[PDB]
């Protein structure tokens, strides 16, 4: 039995400017007090075509961590625009939350991220190089794929 | 694509 | 009568390299339902001289609030060193945890940060830019300093 | 060609308690200036076993209408719970955005809206009668279903 | 089609 | 306590 | 940036008997001339349990205000004594000074307030009720507590 | 100081 369970992931500020950090509220639940710290990531799919897009964009060691019910605000920043191929810019792209424990991922949040111009003009005649400052970030919250892993807690 | 990795979420 | 009280605050992963991002254990008591989010921020006082220098930190919307005890860890990342007067780098700085109702401040946690290097050769012989990759933040946890503020809750 | 055209919706104040106000910003083109004033409504469906229990939350005549971009947001008050059967009230039901022009209806704009309570323990044993003011609305905000009418607009 | 064909 | 009204002053 | 900015207050004629007058000689910067008066107050917490005995000790209008540097000996009668629960007499309690410009507090200044008997036969075996005429009050001079408040300077 | 911008907190 994991010794770590999530129970609820919110998709807080959302949506809003392509600039603007991701933030979550998630809850989990740990079925006994853990040796190790738990390690956080906010992974975001730059390129479907390839994973060498990927950027983490944050990565966060929270411990000890006791028995109980626990609650957790991350925040991460945007992506580095410089890194991600233009013609993946504009459109449906992935973010992922995981969680490691010693070394071994043992959850997977996975959301799709639409990014798109709010104004009229833009949407209709898009800039021939993406433009960030004008793209607003939908996170389709609603839709969470959640996966699980088998890993050796002790 | 349902097959496609549009399934690394 | 204030609708929310903060009743706790306990300082994570400290003392911890100045790249490591904030975490804070807030323990907080809901007296009725809330209408609308709580607004929470972490600020960082980049220089005691001007507040021109502070960095929103994190700033996050939160809710529907139910009544009852809530207890969450709120992550922000370090602050950006490019913000920073190097004069203001090297000693005590300050951090501030608020949170914010229908517009209106109604309480600020702050700390006195004391950010420095750990080697001997750089304590003595300090750069004349800091380097932010060599200092140690030490938050002086045992000490905040809480303000509160009479608000308008409806 | 419609004289009208709504380009986007946008929900605000979402999630929400229950009781909160229902807000939206439409955004709509008028290719020509309209003689008489457009119909907008909002429509809760109580619930999905019988139409009998829709509530009309708002109908709003408003003109002359320019040419050009128009924005607003348009608010109505929550439906009333002693109106809702029991059954209804936790779970997914559905919320329309209506615009009429001289009788003729032209666009309907549907969400489905996921009411559920905002604390654990009520969601793990709710009461015997539905509490609303402990009930949490969520509208699927991402996927509107947009739906045009062919209308005669003189 | 059952009537979620209201939206 | 740190966190009692000994923060009135 | 405040009209007005508060850079000492020395705490005179301390420590003395529980009955002798509240003294404070306090200093402060205008940097430009004010078109109102400043309000300035003296308030005795009678209870840390509850705001309901709080004892507005004086109350005074002092203006015109010029730009430049001010001395202010503020003189305020001691509480009454009539007012203050015997649980709070003996130890700790605060007392502040405030100032007002056109309705709207701008600074608060606290103090603790030590109160205790000098006879040795008293501290070791206090009165059932307080005896205010064999108190002596210590205020802790070296330790303010400056709170400052965002206003509308005009 | 204790009157200086060391009261940011």
Redesign the interface.
Same mark, same amino acid.
């Given at each position: 039995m994991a010794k770590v369970q999530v129970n609820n992931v919110v998709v !807080? %500020?959302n949506?809003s400017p392509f600039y603007n950090?991701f933030?979550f @509220?998630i809850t989990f639940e740990c079925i006994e007090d853990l040796s190790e710290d738990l390690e956080w990531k906010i992974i975001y799919?730059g390129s479907?075509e390839s @994973?060498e897009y990927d950027q983490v964009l %944050?990565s =966060? !060691? =929270?411990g000890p961590v006791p028995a109980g019910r626990?609650?957790? =605000?991350?925040?991460? %920043?945007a992506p580095n625009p410089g890194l991600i191929p233009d013609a993946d810019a504009v459109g =449906?792209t992935?973010v !992922?939350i995981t969680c490691t424990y010693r070394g071994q991922e043992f959850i997977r949040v996975?959301?799709?991220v639409?990014n798109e111009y709010?104004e009229?003009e833009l949407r209709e005649n898009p800039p021939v190089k993406p433009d960030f400052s004008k793209l607003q970030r939908?996170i !389709?919250?609603?839709?969470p794929?959640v996966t699980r892993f088998h890993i050796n807690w002790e | 694509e349902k097959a496609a990795x549009x399934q690394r979420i």
């Open positions: !807080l %500020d949506p950090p933030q @509220e799919v479907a @994973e %944050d =966060v !060691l =929270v626990h609650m957790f =605000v991350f925040q991460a %920043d =449906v992935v !992922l996975g959301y799709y639409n709010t009229t939908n !389709l919250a609603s839709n794929r | -």
